[PDB]
Design a protein around this nucleic acid. Structure first.
Ligand SMILES: CN[C@@H]1[C@@H](O)[C@@H](O[C@@H]2[C@@H](O)[C@H](O[C@H]3O[C@H]([C@@H](C)O)[C@@H](O)[C@H](O)[C@H]3N)[C@@H](N)C[C@H]2N)OC[C@]1(C)O
Ligand SMILES: CN[C@@H]1[C@@H](O)[C@@H](O[C@@H]2[C@@H](O)[C@H](O[C@H]3O[C@H]([C@@H](C)O)[C@@H](O)[C@H](O)[C@H]3N)[C@@H](N)C[C@H]2N)OC[C@]1(C)O
Ligand SMILES: CN[C@@H]1[C@@H](O)[C@@H](O[C@@H]2[C@@H](O)[C@H](O[C@H]3O[C@H]([C@@H](C)O)[C@@H](O)[C@H](O)[C@H]3N)[C@@H](N)C[C@H]2N)OC[C@]1(C)O
Ligand SMILES: CN[C@@H]1[C@@H](O)[C@@H](O[C@@H]2[C@@H](O)[C@H](O[C@H]3O[C@H]([C@@H](C)O)[C@@H](O)[C@H](O)[C@H]3N)[C@@H](N)C[C@H]2N)OC[C@]1(C)O
Ligand SMILES: CN[C@@H]1[C@@H](O)[C@@H](O[C@@H]2[C@@H](O)[C@H](O[C@H]3O[C@H]([C@@H](C)O)[C@@H](O)[C@H](O)[C@H]3N)[C@@H](N)C[C@H]2N)OC[C@]1(C)O
Lengths: 148, 185, 155
RNA sequence: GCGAGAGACCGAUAGCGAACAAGUACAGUGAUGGAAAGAUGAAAAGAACUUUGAAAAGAGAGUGAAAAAGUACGUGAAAUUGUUGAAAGGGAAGGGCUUGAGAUCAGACUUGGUACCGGGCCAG
RNA sequence: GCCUAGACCGAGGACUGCGGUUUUUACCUAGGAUGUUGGCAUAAUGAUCUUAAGUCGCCCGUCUUGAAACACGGACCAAGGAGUCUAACGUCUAUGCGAGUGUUUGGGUGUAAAACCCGUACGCGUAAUGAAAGUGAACGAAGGUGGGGGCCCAUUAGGGUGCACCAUCGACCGAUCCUGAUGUGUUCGGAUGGAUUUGAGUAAGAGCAUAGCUGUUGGGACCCGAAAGAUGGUGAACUAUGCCUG
RNA sequence: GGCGAAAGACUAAUCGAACCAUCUAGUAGCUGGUUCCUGCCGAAGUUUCCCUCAGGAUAGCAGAAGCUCGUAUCAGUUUUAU
RNA sequence: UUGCUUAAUUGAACGUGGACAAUUGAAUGAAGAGCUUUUAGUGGGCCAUUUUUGGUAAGCAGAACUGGCGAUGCGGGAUGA
RNA sequence: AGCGUGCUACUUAUACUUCACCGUGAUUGCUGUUUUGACGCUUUCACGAGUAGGCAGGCGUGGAGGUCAGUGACGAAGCCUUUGCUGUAAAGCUGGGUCGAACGGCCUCUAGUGCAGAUCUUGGUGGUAGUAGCAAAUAUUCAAAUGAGAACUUUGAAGACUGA
């Protein structure tokens, strides 16, 4: 609200806080990103290195949907098990009856390997998997099943 | 006149009250101001200063950090004190029986504490059942984990994150960040 | 307007225990009973009277004598008097019954006061006549003449 | 364009340029440019009549709750001006501080209590 | 040690202290003024206005090293008159929820632009790195060392546990350089081990949303101010020149 | 564009490029102004880069918010040694 | 301890265990120490003592250290940054 | 009452010393007496110059939600005024006059919210000042009539001019 601004406190003081010498003027220094290579180089080279120039190759008509692959780590993987049967699955799961985890149906593209699993067999369904993620899944007695 | 050896009329620079207008936080400040004034237990004074802290200075404390604190040698029975929010952590495999005193518990954190037979209590209950902070263990969250902290003190060769709106190859990866484009800083 | 609050009390605190135990006046060495005085202020300013007795209210008892001057037995304040070096022997005057209560406020003058004035005048005139010109000196008013410097003058 | 309902909007130098006989009056050869200007009172009851004046008007009177509302009309500020009273004034005036003089204002005989008690102020 | 002359002040408001004198569970000059008397209340007293006297006092605003300036604006008065709103953002703070968070595009409903209710997506966060093909975060109690509030055990000291945060030596993921196992569409694969290299990474999540001040950028952008440039129109009643008729 | 026995003259008091409306609140590193009170703190005219020299960015000097702690080792100063 | 180093059982760097306690190894001071974020104005200066360059010199022009004025009234120098 | 030099007293700054009061910063203590303000009360010490500029706490204006079952034709708002009072101040309140229909306190919300200046805008008004001035084109006069009023109208008499 206007009653809380410093404009109200500057009333009666000549320069409105902008100085007598400098004198708030229209556009000293130019408009926008003007002078980025000339008189604003000391700002851009300090706070935005990399600004000027070209790196890498172009990609005409890039479709971002081709690259959709949300990641889930092993330390989070049991959140996908139904919450009402998680406690039971942790106790009763064996090599002959293990929980199935359909990661793609939960909206994930790749299973990554950060963290530690419960020492319980699981069946993990995924489009992609990292080398360590599968190795940790097989070490608790589980398996990764590739789906498309 | 005076040849002053320090700046005159300088405020202490420390917060002496909560900026908050929550009346119940004020009730807690009232209780712990009494406790810090009349008891000379160092714990009560620490708790009093903590009640003044702003939100970013009270980072949330997860139940996994609490469990690691409870695994310290001799600390399995201590009362965990958090002046702030206790949050759930779904990366945790097990959580023990424990008494946690906090300002706020998220629903998941409270369900997990209660399910393992523990107790989730507020700070006034803590004052009643430990007026000097006996057998307590204060746990603080990570202050510097804030995303804003990544951009502090940015400069050449500093290794801090730039303040940038979009991320990609066309956004500040050329001259100044690459020897093939002039120089690298 | 700002309305008064509950905690605003009208209670009047008692004062603290003052430690001002008063102790008796020490008059000037020049004030001795029988000293002739010059009145510096009041109705009788300029009169030369006889100092009789120190009263317990700090004041001085003086008489003209009323016959010589026209000023009676009355109180004067020591700060409004010049004490000269002329002395009257007043061992023969009885002033044992003049005190603060004797001038308690009640023209017409009580027969007590007139009788006392006659009695004191009798003894004073007995004693005053022994010094030549003392009666005429007491009858005359004091004034400052031209060239009279009180810092240089002895009284 | 036609028909409606609204607003934490503006309130006659504002709000459309225009609340009014406003795209008017008026200017320019022309294209165009373009104002100012709202309110007596409930009701004209808008002051009959007499008198002075050439008349405009004045003075009485009259109406009205009011004429300190008279179509120069609600209230009616300031600059500026007249009259009246008071005061000051040798090539400016005005200001601060201090006191005097003159004027104004204020307060304890209290919400006084019951001839006495006791209080208020200024002083030794 | 003693005597003696003046001036200004009197903050505080039961008691509580330190001392002293002791003749006393007492008294004092010792943690800040009391006693007494006169006058006045038709007033001595205090404030303001006007004016006199004494003393001091240049005209404000502004640019400026420097203004009373022979620098500029200002004859006077009223009313109007200049950091705003918006899109997107940085820091800080308050609040709700929290590994999530955001009802309001839309649908339901209504006492009808409100209030109340609903969810799929989507945004941002939960993973990084590389130009890219791609690959993708625990040797260990999520490590060692030195500090570290608080807590625990003692009995100054001392012993333990030590979150946040800090210094330091490592470990993990991506990029780069080397090595090159079992194998092979024999040119692929990349086990394993190295490297004063490199990243806006990991190492028991901290974010999302609303609001507020300040700061930023684009916008008429605090307000008023060019000389110019462009598009479409109107003029030869003046005047320049030709022509026609007087 | 006209028109000029030529002066850059004249083209409706307008001519080294008329008038009118619009683009248009054109842009201005330049001049002017910028509206209430008290309280606390309190500068700079210097460094580097800039078609930079009446302007900016950058560092410095200033304010604000604090935060971690509570005598730890600090100082526009001396002494001793070097 | 080590993959560095020595002819080496030599060193180097970092350590376990033991000992040395308020004179923990000069003075004086210390409205405490450390740490972070964010943003304003400014980026024409000028004067004095001393050192000092160009110039005949200048209330001229240009440097050094400190104090000032600017941004500051007050008493004195009649008057005066 | 000059110059050199020594001495005694004396004069007075917003400086120093003691004391009062305001504020700022720090500081002592306060819950079986914490008592409806603990954002409060209380003990003690030190400090106070300031342009540009930063921040804090307040004052004032239009309009909005809530509240005072607030003020008001027995006089709201506005305006004038040595009637005074309060606040360091921004300002708030009140007596008297004028006036005629609405308006205010408190808790909050919100903004087209505060003027001395801009050769600012519109309107209004001064000093200047009863002043500059009302002087080219030959020139007017007597009487009567009319009329409240005649240098200026009309008629008569005359003197003139334009000079085809
Ligand atoms: C007969 N003269 C007319 C006259 O009617 C005039 O009217 C004003 C009138 O407008 C005023 O009245 C005014 O009232 C208020 C307030 C300021 O008074 C104004 O805001 C409003 O505009 C106006 N109606 C009035 N007080 C006087 C008349 N001469 O309007 C113009 C005019 C030519 O002068
Ligand atoms: C412990 N040191 C390791 C160092 O050994 C190295 O590890 C390489 C690793 O980079 C190689 O891996 C590399 O090359 C393979 C490619 C060959 O398929 C890629 O898939 C992979 O993404 C890439 N990182 C791996 N193939 C062998 C390790 N020793 O990686 C760097 C390091 C962390 O410093
Ligand atoms: C391949 N040789 C490695 C050498 O490169 C180095 O490893 C670095 C390591 O120091 C870096 O890590 C460094 O930087 C990270 C930062 C990026 O967050 C810090 O977290 C970390 O503390 C710091 N040590 C790590 N990012 C890459 C390794 N190759 O460590 C020594 C070594 C084993 O010789
Ligand atoms: C208790 N376990 C800790 C674990 O918490 C974690 O600690 C990190 C620590 O490594 C980080 O610190 C690290 O990264 C910073 C960074 C600025 O690059 C480096 O400067 C620093 O040298 C490096 N150690 C610190 N910033 C946060 C802690 N939680 O990693 C180290 C650890 C010992 O395993
Ligand atoms: C022996 N070396 C001296 C050096 O000490 C110094 O001398 C100053 C002298 O110049 C000062 O004097 C200076 O300043 C005063 C005054 C303004 O203070 C002036 O009146 C004087 O003219 C001026 N020279 C004097 N007051 C003190 C000495 N130490 O400067 C001069 C010098 C010759 O270099």
């Amino acid at each position: 609200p206007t009653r809380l601004t410093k404009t109200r406190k500057h009333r009666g003081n000549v320069s409105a806080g902008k100085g007598r010498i400098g004198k708030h003027r229209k556009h000293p220094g130019g408009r926008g990103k003007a002078g980025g290579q000339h008189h604003h180089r000391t700002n851009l080279d300090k706070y935005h290195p990399g600004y000027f120039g070209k790196v890498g190759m172009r990609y005409f008509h890039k479709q971002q949907n081709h690259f959709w692959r949300p990641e889930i780590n092993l330390d989070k993987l049991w959140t996908l098990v139904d919450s009402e049967k998680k406690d039971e699955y942790l106790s009763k799961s064996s090599a002959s009856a293990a929980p199935v985890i359909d990661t793609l149906a939960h909206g994930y593209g790749k299973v990554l390997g950060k963290g530690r699993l419960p020492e319980v067999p699981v069946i993990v369904k995924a489009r992609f998997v990292s080398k360590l993620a599968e190795e940790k899944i097989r070490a608790v007695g589980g398996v990764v099943e590739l789906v498309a | 006149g005076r040849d002053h050896t320090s700046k005159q009329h300088v405020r202490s620079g420390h917060r002496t009250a909560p900026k908050s207008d929550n009346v119940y936080l004020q009730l807690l400040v009232k209780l712990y101001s009494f406790l810090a004034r009349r008891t000379d237990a160092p714990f009560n004074k620490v708790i009093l200063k903590s009640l003044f802290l702003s939100k970013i200075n009270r980072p949330p404390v997860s139940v996994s950090r609490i469990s690691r604190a409870l695994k310290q040698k001799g600390a399995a029975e201590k009362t965990i004190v958090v002046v702030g929010t206790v949050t759930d952590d779904n990366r945790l495999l097990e959580f023990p029986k424990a008494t946690i005193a906090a300002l706020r518990f998220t629903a998941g954190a409270k369900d997990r504490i209660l399910k393992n037979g523990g107790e989730a209590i507020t700070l006034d209950q803590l004052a009643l059942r430990a007026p000097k902070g006996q057998n307590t263990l204060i746990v603080r969250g990570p202050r510097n984990s804030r995303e804003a902290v990544r951009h502090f003190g940015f400069g050449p060769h500093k290794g801090k994150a730039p303040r940038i709106l979009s991320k990609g190859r066309k956004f500040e990866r050329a001259r100044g960040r690459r020897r093939s484009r002039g120089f690298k800083v | 307007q700002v309305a008064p609050k509950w905690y605003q009390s009208e209670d009047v605190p008692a004062p603290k225990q003052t430690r001002k135990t008063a102790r008796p006046q020490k008059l000037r060495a020049s004030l001795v009973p029988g000293t002739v005085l010059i009145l510096l202020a009041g109705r009788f300013r300029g009169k030369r009277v006889v100092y009789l007795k120190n009263l317990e209210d700090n004041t001085l008892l003086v008489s003209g004598p009323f016959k010589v001057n026209g000023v009676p037995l009355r109180r004067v304040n020591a700060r409004y008097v010049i004490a000269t070096s002329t002395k009257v022997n007043v061992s023969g005057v009885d002033v044992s019954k003049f005190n603060v209560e004797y001038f308690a406020r009640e023209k017409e003058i009580k027969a007590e006061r007139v009788a006392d004035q006659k009695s004191v005048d009798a003894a004073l005139l007995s004693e005053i006549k022994k010094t030549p010109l003392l009666k005429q000196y007491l009858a005359a008013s004091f004034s400052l003449k031209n060239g009279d410097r009180p810092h240089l003058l002895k009284f």
